[PDB]
Amino acid sequence: PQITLWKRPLVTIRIGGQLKEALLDTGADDTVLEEMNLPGKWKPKMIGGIGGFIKVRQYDQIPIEICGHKAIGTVLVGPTPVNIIGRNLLTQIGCTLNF
Amino acid sequence: PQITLWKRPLVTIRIGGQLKEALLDTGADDTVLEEMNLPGKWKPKMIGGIGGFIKVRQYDQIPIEICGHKAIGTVLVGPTPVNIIGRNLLTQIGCTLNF
Numbered sequence A, B: 001p002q003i004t005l006w007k008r009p010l011v012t013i014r015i016g017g018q019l020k021e022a023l024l025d026t027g028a029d030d031t032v033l034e035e036m037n038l039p040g041k042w043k044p045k046m047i048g049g050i051g052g053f054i055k056v057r058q059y060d061q062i063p064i065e066i067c068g069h070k071a072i073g074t075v076l077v078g079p080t081p082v083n084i085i086g087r088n089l090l091t092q093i094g095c096t097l098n099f
């Protein structure tokens, strides 16, 4: 697909039975979703946004489907105002910026 | 150009004869640059994201050259952690996400 940037590039993502709306975000190093009880081990982490840092839980090797494209990798969970798909997963679905 | 996402999509911009490094950010509605002096009558503004809110100065109709592509639009100036080129200017230079 080609995705223009006239509005926020919001897409449907799927993880283990849950559907969520998430931002395709080239300015984010990693992927963060709010409110979800993922399975497995996790470790605490701090990530920086425009106003400062939030605390998140880092889950590794989590399968996620984004616009029908399968991926697997690190998913952070914490109090993000908007669900974000970051570069760690964007690369996995073959996403580039073009102009 | 095509820009991949294994690394941060940092590119050189030119504004008021100054060269700066800025992030091409599909997750940003607005363009926000680190503290600098720009001429013109700016309006005080607040923006909130991950980590909360910052105070910025909104300058309108500012020319900026992004990888040799000319844009003229709104630029926010304040204590952003990194120079950010948002969708308002990315659309002016014909930038899309593709996968």
Ligand SMILES: Cc1cccc(C)c1OCC(=O)N[C@@H](Cc1ccccc1)[C@@H](O)C[C@H](Cc1ccccc1)NC(=O)[C@H](C(C)C)N1CCCNC1=O
Residues within 6 Å of the ligand: A025, A026, A027, A028, A029, A030, A031, A032, A047, A048, A049, A050, A051, A081, A082, A084, A086, B025, B026, B027, B028, B029, B030, B031, B032, B047, B048, B049, B050, B081, B082, B084, B086
């Ligand atoms: C940098 C990073 C590292 C690891 C993991 C993650 C998720 C990371 O990214 C976190 C992050 O906030 N990145 C931002 C840019 C960034 C990178 C590095 C440091 C600081 C910031 C940006 O791309 C996304 C973020 C999304 C957002 C969040 C809450 C509300 C609305 C939007 N967008 C915004 O904050 C924008 C700003 C930039 C104008 N924004 C806020 C006003 C309303 N609308 C809007 O679009």
